[PDB]
Amino acid sequence: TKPHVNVGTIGHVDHGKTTLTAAITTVLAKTYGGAARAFDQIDNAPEEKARGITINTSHVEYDTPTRHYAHVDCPGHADYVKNMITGAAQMDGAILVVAATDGPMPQTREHILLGRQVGVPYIIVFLNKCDMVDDEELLELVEMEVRELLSQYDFPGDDTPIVRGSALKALEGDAEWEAKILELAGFLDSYIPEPERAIDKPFLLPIEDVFSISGRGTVVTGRVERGIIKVGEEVEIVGIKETQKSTCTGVEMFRKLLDEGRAGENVGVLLRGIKREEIERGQVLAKPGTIKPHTKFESEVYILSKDEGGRHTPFFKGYRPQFYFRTTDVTGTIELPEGVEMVMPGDNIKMVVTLIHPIAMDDGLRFAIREGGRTVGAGVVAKVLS
Ligand SMILES: Nc1nc2c(ncn2[C@@H]2O[C@H](COP(=O)(O)OP(=O)(O)O)[C@@H](O)[C@H]2O)c(=O)[nH]1
Numbered sequence: 001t002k003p004h005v006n007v008g009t010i011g012h013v014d015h016g017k018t019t020l021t022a023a024i025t026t027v028l029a030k031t032y033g034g035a036a037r038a039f040d041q042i043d044n045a046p047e048e049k050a051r052g053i054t055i056n057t058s059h060v061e062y063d064t065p066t067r068h069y070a071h072v073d074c075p076g077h078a079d080y081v082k083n084m085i086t087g088a089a090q091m092d093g094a095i096l097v098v099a100a101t102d103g104p105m106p107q108t109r110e111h112i113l114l115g116r117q118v119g120v121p122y123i124i125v126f127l128n129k130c131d132m133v134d135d136e137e138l139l140e141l142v143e144m145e146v147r148e149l150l151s152q153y154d155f156p157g158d159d160t161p162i163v164r165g166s167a168l169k170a171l172e173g174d175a176e177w178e179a180k181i182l183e184l185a186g187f188l189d190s191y192i193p194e195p196e197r198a199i200d201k202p203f204l205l206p207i208e209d210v211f212s213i214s215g216r217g218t219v220v221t222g223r224v225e226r227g228i229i230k231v232g233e234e235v236e237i238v239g240i241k242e243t244q245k246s247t248c249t250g251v252e253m254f255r256k257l258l259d260e261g262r263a264g265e266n267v268g269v270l271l272r273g274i275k276r277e278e279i280e281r282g283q284v285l286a287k288p289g290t291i292k293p294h295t296k297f298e299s300e301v302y303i304l305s306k307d308e309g310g311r312h313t314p315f316f317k318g319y320r321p322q323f324y325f326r327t328t329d330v331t332g333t334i335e336l337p338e339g340v341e342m343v344m345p346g347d348n349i350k351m352v353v354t355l356i357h358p359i360a361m362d363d364g365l366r367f368a369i370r371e372g373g374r375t376v377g378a379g380v381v382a383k384v385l386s
């Protein structure tokens with residue numbers, strides 16, 4: 001069917017993220033077909049939980065002539081912080097809403113900064129509330145400021161699409177302003193490339209279990225997160241101990257014996273010449289030379305509030321929690337940012353971590369911070385260091 005693209009609105013409080021999300025669904029419904037959604041339905045976001053965190057997020061769907069979008073919009077700045085760090089969402093692109101009446105504000109900068117830390121790949125801007133400002137000189141200056149802010153965080157500010165519009169008058173039915181929503185939807189379609197499919201990425205399978213089987217073989221089980229493993233191909237077993245090479249001599253699903261395992265399937269992968277005791281929890285299977293084992297990384301983390309079931313007590317530079325990467329806990333030590341010495345429940349910070357065992361990782365890998373098997377925080381690898 002139609003390509004599916006994950007997007008969302010980001011930007012400072014009251015700059016109009018919700019009004020825009022409802023305008024997009026409404027204008028697109030009236031122009032290309034679908035269901036309009038009103039302000040009040042999106043603004044009243046439900047709660048959701050995963051990785052052990054609670055976030056208020058509205059999920060909306062809309063279509064352009066050629067694509068289908070799943071769009072996320074959230075009530076407060078804290079919701080955005082939580083969603084960006086985990087991957088409740090996992091935006092292929094974001095719409096940064098900047099009210100022309102205020103220019104960029106503190107949360108404008110923070111959402112861009114986090115977008116980069118967490119690897120949001122593209123940002124398009126909707127310069128909202130242009131029905132309140134006549135002055136073209138002022139609109140031009142606001143645009144220049146946003147482009148500069150974007151480039152400070154490494155986004156291509158000079159080449160970023162910026163639409164001048166009014167989410168409110170578009171929502172209200174003013175054709176001239178509705179046309180700017182259609183321009184925005186055009187940039188979602190032309191500026192965000194079709195996302196790479198998991199199936200097209202290098203093979204990767206987090207090992208969930210291991211069995212010594214029949215003849216002499218060890219089988220490792222897990223879900224194919226990415227790519228495809230074919231019988232006869234070589235694999236690296238990466239993480240925890242020194243990388244090993246092996247060959248897939250079999251792929252099975254229940255009683256079905258297959259010639260390959262593909263993205264999204266739960267399989268058992270038969271490994272040649274590896275004994276059960278060479279397999280450790282936390283290891284992954286990967287296409288060789290495609291992911292490396294690391295111990296040290298920079299991350300952005302959100303620490304759960306007491307209320308969300310997180311710690312009730314703050315932590316300091318000596319904190320030595322477990323970092324749960326895909327399938328298992330790995331203890332690590334932390335390094336706190338400049339200034340900081342106390343991290344309160346409910347806080348989000350950049351944290352440098354050193355694990356005691358290497359984990360196959362690349363930027364964007366998510367993790368849970370655990371304490372005696374209880375989730376107390378959530379993070380994303382922003383930069384692998386060694
Ligand atoms: N005049 C005007 N007001 C707007 C526009 N977009 C949003 N608003 C108002 O700004 C306030 C904040 O909008 P909202 O969508 O809730 O902002 P959010 O906090 O970013 O979601 C509400 O009163 C909206 O009606 C616009 O284009 N023009």
Ligand SMILES: [Mg+2]
Pocket residue numbers: 016017018019043074075
């Ligand atoms: Mg809102």
